[PDB]
Design an enzyme around this catalytic site. Sequence first.
Site, PDB file in Angstrom:
ATOM      1  N   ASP A   1      -4.219  11.824   7.544  1.00 61.08           N
ATOM      2  CA  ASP A   1      -3.046  11.248   8.403  1.00 61.08           C
ATOM      3  C   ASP A   1      -2.319  11.821   9.607  1.00 61.08           C
ATOM      4  OD1 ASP A   1      -1.962   8.966   6.441  1.00 61.08           O
ATOM      5  OD2 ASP A   1      -2.336  10.670   4.809  1.00 61.08           O
TER       6      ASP A   1
ATOM      7  N   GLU B   1       1.121  -1.079   0.059  1.00 54.88           N
ATOM      8  CA  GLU B   1       0.031   0.075  -0.037  1.00 54.88           C
ATOM      9  C   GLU B   1       1.163   1.030  -0.039  1.00 54.88           C
ATOM     10  OE1 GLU B   1      -2.328   1.350   3.252  1.00 54.88           O
ATOM     11  OE2 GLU B   1      -3.893   1.942   2.282  1.00 54.88           O
TER      12      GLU B   1
ATOM     13  N   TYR C   1     -10.577  -2.346   3.723  1.00 54.11           N
ATOM     14  CA  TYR C   1      -9.796  -1.850   4.838  1.00 54.11           C
ATOM     15  C   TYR C   1     -10.346  -1.682   6.110  1.00 54.11           C
ATOM     16  CZ  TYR C   1      -5.891   0.928   6.348  1.00 54.11           C
ATOM     17  OH  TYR C   1      -4.803   1.610   7.062  1.00 54.11           O
TER      18      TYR C   1
END
Lengths: 254, 254, 390, 390
Positions: free
Chosen positions: A60, A49, A175
Amino acid sequence: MERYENLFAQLNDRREGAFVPFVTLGDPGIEQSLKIIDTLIDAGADALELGVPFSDPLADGPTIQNANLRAFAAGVTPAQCFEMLALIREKHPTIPIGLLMYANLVFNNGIDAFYARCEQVGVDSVLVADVPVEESAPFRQAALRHNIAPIFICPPNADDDLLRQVASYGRGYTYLLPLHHLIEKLKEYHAAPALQGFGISSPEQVSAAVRAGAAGAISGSAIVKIIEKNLASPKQMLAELRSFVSAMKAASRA
Amino acid sequence: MERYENLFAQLNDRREGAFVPFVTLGDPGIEQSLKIIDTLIDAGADALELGVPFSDPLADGPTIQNANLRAFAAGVTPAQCFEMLALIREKHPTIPIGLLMYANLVFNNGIDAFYARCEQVGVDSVLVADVPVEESAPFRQAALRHNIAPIFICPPNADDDLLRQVASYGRGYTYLLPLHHLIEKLKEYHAAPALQGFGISSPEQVSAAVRAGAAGAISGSAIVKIIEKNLASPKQMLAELRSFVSAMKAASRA
Amino acid sequence: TTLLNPYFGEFGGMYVPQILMPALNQLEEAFVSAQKDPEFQAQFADLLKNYAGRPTALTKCQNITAGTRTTLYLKREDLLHGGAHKTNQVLGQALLAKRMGKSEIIAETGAGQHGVASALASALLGLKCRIYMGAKDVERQSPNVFRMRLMGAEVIPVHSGSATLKDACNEALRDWPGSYETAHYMLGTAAGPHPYPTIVREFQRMIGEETKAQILDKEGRLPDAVIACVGGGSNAIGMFADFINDTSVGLIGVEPGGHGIETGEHGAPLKHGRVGIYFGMKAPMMQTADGQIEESYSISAGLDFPSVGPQHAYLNSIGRADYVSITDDEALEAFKTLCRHEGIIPALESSHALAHALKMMREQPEKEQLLVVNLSGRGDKDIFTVHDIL
Amino acid sequence: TTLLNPYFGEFGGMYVPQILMPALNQLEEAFVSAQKDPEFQAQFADLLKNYAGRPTALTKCQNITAGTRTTLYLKREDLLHGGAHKTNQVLGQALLAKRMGKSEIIAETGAGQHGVASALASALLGLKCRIYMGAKDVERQSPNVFRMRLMGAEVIPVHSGSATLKDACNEALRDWPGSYETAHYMLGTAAGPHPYPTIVREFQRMIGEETKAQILDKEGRLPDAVIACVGGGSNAIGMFADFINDTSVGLIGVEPGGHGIETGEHGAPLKHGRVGIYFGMKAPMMQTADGQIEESYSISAGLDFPSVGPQHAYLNSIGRADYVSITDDEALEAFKTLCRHEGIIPALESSHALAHALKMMREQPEKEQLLVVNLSGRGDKDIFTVHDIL
Ligand SMILES: *Cc1c(COP(=O)(O)O)cnc(C)c1O
Ligand SMILES: *Cc1c(COP(=O)(O)O)cnc(C)c1O
Ligand code: NA
Ligand code: NA
């Protein structure tokens, strides 16, 4: 997408989980990042990934934000990243390769154009970090016309309508961000197989993810902290990434 | 008051005007100011108009404001000023001595008390700079109980009611700030004799004041500019004040 | 001769040189005429409403008072155009100068808010404004000096005496006798020679008139006490005037106590000085023992005028208002309490008023009491003084 | 699923990570509920009237316009509590956070006025407020950082990316997914993911509603054009909304042109950038050729948001509003003209709006035209920037 179906079928013949590390393309420079990635693969990563540096990574944490900073200090652009990818693929024909993208970078020059460029260099999936299922139609549809798997996050309190859309709309893997319940729902709805992500940072969580029924685990930022820590010795950085990946992958084995 | 009546009678026997210089008490220090004043007198001043330093002289121009600054730089107070005055008087029994006062300094410790202290040291008149005829009753009355002449300014556009009050209320002289008309009105109302003030700064204005019919002239700040200019040589300062006063007084003569 | 009385019991008067009496009599004449003129009254009302932004709010402070039986409102002159109440009476005195045919304005300023006021009113109304400011104060008030210049005014530094506010008040009184045919002296508080204490009260009295209608509306009864700081006395006499004949309402004025009364470094001549005659009037002054005038000390630069209006000295002497003091650290405490509990940064002048209300509540927290504090201006301009101290 | 539409033609949307969708849906639910709740409507109205000081005046500027057939009014959001219009919609979003049971506020700030706003509303309403501010901006906005702290807020510096406003907007979006059960994200313009562009328009729309009733009162007819600066779009969409269905009224938005469009150092993404997806929405952005987001340049720090609200992009695309730009020296000129001719110091953000009105008058001085400029805030805070340039 094909390459993940092949992978999970192979892992399942071995009763084995997948271990998937994340890193940012070009951190801490292009040639160094090419060697970290050949290292992750030789040490046993089952898929990668990969992040393209983007100026405002509003989904993030600090580790990743500092990865993009190092990559931009080295001049890294999306164009350079697509070159990178074509080399990785030419060197490794079967490993699945996913991207972690911000929307703007995919919508930039035309969302169909983006998915066609991933399909030309040999990417197999794309997760776009700030597009939720409610806004995903043009993204999924374009991924799918170009044989690319659109991946979606199934968040921890996912209500049942969200379960069903993530199962319907994703491909490749889910995910996954009580666990045994999220996981059994996703299988009920015939979702793509689930990778546990977030906090996967030592061997025992790999093992426990597989034992909850997930197909594997994703290490969202532990590979990145090993770069950050070893910036002053490239050779020592490779070694410690080999050691860590070898043990995470050891843990997925049956 | 007596001393001005005697003076103007003497001047009139000589067909002569009066010349009255102003200075600030203690500028530029007590002993220096005592000698400037004995100099003005020996050179021919007919009467003195003396200022007590006050922190906010809102009816004085720059020259005077700087005189008070020098006096306060030397420590001069109203008390010291009253000592000064008693010495001047002891040394010179006939010359009229007026004060130019701000109201606060007279009202301070009691307006009757102030006029009694001027009457003990031998002052003959007081002009208070910020008390107009409309507010003057307690001042005039107290001056008058202590044999002190209250002096008032007759300003240049004085209307007829103001003429008549300034004539009625003043004694000693009228401080006069078309001239020939102001002057003839004051005599009509039997006012105290008129001194022209303001701008009297050379011989020819003395002469012209007497010729308009005034009893004399007052040099409101030219004596002060001669100190200011000669601060670095006390001896030269005396000389130039002798020269200037001698010529102003020459000009009042017939 | 005057048309209205120049004195409040013993205080007040016209103690100016004779050559300035015609300026004052002309100004008193003009003002009496304007106060009977409904076209003037409409002109004033309209600038205060559509230019200055009247009426100003009356805000209830419930977080401050919680746990006690105090209800406190703040009258919000900090939301007036320019940031303080001084804008109401400069728009009125500018219109009076135009009524008399004048084209020029003189004004004096200490911390510079009256200079800013008087420069905005002159800009809006086509007058050429010059402002006297003592040189020590110009050096410490750059932001204010440049606002006055942005707005067109001439700022003239005054270097005589102490080079602070009393010295520029002297310089204004020096200029005006040579210029009164075409210039108006826009005095910036309720003090000075008659008719200024009257004029400025009447051009500020809408603070108290709006407070009464707003309190009656919201609580059905008048305040127990209305509380205002006292530098020279204009924002206080503008809140008190409409309530003087309501004898149940307490009128409380608060002078700056600086480092403490007992230190001698304060600004409270009404309760701590001595009557003298200066600036045109007989009133309590900051002065030495032999009669020289001195400066008032406060952490708040605006409470610097070294006397007080003569109507305050009169209302204290007959006991219809009471006066107290608040020190620098009491004011600083109330400025911090208000920022953190109500989201309102008050001027450190106003903070003195709020401090005294906060002590009326905290010493007797179960006394039922309805208090209004006049929040005479905002406190953006104090945030670095309050920064560096702390 | 949503209850209201998230898009304005193609612009808008909800482009956030999946874990933040429940926060947005909850907030949209709550807002629809509050807009039908008359006890909420009364609560909002009362803080805006007795706390913030609504309605604000509409001032005619006759000195500015003399010699031309332009009549110009200025809507005076500079007299609102805090000095700019940003106080209206923070009191509304604070009350919505209390409606949802939240006790904490997140906010982002660039030049610091939204941080000050959001800290005053949190102080008054008992919420614990933390504010993200890029570290380059905290270094250059001390006065604002200390007002936020005086008022109780936690100010957290953000050092990532460019350490300016886009970087703190990213940091707010990072915090909120872990805290949304008890904290509200008080976004500070009409932009970002749905429902923010809707909420902030509806909590600012009283600027335009009061402008209409005040212009009808004073001139008997609506404006020819109403003109507002456009940083992210809240003061402009708050003046435009009530006039959108009045098709004779021109709506003009003015973006910062900085050093000049043709220099590339400006802040005008609506007319000069390119549609992208960032901060939650699809809208015109300041961005490089390969898609990285960049900063907006202006002499005015407040016009720094590097995109624009999506309702502006929609009203431009259908031609119902027009957008232009004004450069740094055009703005500086209009800020000086207003100080010296009207006694009003405007914010250099607002100055951009006034500059464009002054060019509409000066290029065609005999065109009869009735213009309103939204004077979105005051300019005390700019006087030294405008000092040092000149
Ligand atoms: C000047 C000022 C004061 C003091 O003057 P007063 O005449 O006593 O009102 C008070 N508050 C503010 C905000 C000021 O600017
Ligand atoms: C922030 C600000 C602006 C810019 O934000 P918008 O959302 O476009 O209104 C404009 N004027 C002032 C005074 C500001 O503080
Ligand atoms: Na005082
Ligand atoms: Na913008």
